[PDB]
Amino acid sequence: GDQRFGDLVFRQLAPNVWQHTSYLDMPGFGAVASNGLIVRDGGRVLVVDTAWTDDQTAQILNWIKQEINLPVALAVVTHAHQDKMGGMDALHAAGIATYANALSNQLAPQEGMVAAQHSLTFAANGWVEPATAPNFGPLKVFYPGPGHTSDNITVGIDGTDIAFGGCLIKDSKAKSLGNLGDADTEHYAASARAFGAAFPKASMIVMSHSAPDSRAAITHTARMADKLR
Numbered sequence: 001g002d003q004r005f006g007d008l009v010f011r012q013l014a015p016n017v018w019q020h021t022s023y024l025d026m027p028g029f030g031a032v033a034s035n036g037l038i039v040r041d042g043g044r045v046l047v048v049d050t051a052w053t054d055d056q057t058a059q060i061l062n063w064i065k066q067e068i069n070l071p072v073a074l075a076v077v078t079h080a081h082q083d084k085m086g087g088m089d090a091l092h093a094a095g096i097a098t099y100a101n102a103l104s105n106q107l108a109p110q111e112g113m114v115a116a117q118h119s120l121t122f123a124a125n126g127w128v129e130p131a132t133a134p135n136f137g138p139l140k141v142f143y144p145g146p147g148h149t150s151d152n153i154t155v156g157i158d159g160t161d162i163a164f165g166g167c168l169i170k171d172s173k174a175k176s177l178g179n180l181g182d183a184d185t186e187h188y189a190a191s192a193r194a195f196g197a198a199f200p201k202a203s204m205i206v207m208s209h210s211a212p213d214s215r216a217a218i219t220h221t222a223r224m225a226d227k228l229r
């Protein structure tokens with residue numbers, strides 16, 4: 001099921017949904033996988049997260065051209081770390097409109113990232129303010145609260161059982177919560193639980209650093225995050 005395309009891996013998760021995986025040899029951490037999503041919505045393609053680098057992100061676009069052959073209407077990125085935003089310049093060079101949490105765009109320079117072109121804002125209940133996410137099709141964007149980072153956002157795919165937790169959620173057998181340098185230790189557990197409650201019917205939880213898992217990923221993540229309080 002894992003289609004190798006250069007140094008990247010693509011896996012179909014549902015009829016109109018694929019996971020993209022790219023790797024970076026991070027000193028002290030090994031060759032770390034990061035996952036994002038590709039969604040076909042009718043005659044256009046929507047991307048969730050870049051790869052780690054511009055070159056890898058350009059290869060995502062190449063794979064899309066070969067396997068889907070429809071224009072990429074937009075990309076949404078889920079926080080201002082390199083695994084999610086490292087390839088912004090490649091999207092811009094391709095003419096693709098980009099979106100991130102306003103706070104991700106604010107943080108991007110100090111995090112070493114290029115900001116997305118458009119800023120999402122969120123209602124008090126966590127759902128994106130719809131005027132800031134126009135033409136998002138089946139992508140349902142939710143801010144669960146600060147957790148992995150202050151700016152982390154999540155995305156459900158309407159018409160599927162899939163919800164994407166990004167770097168907020170770890171798999172149900174993960175040994176730790178990973179990179180906590182920017183984490184909100186007080187609020188992480190509640191934010192993880194809020195993601196689960198926003199997508200109550202999602203049975204396939206996609207995450208940045210592990211293969212897709214069941215809903216046990218959400219409760220295991222929250223349990224690990226309980227230990228940070």
Ligand SMILES: C[C@H](CS)C(=O)N1CCC(CC(N)=O)CC1
Nearest residue numbers: 029032081082083167178179209
């Ligand atoms: C660049 C990313 C931004 S989340 C990062 O800081 N990582 C270090 C921790 C590592 C944990 C793991 N191997 O699952 C994931 C990659």
Ligand SMILES: [Zn+2]
Nearest residue numbers: 079081148167
């Ligand atoms: Zn991160």
Ligand SMILES: [Zn+2]
Nearest residue numbers: 081083167208
């Ligand atoms: Zn990450």
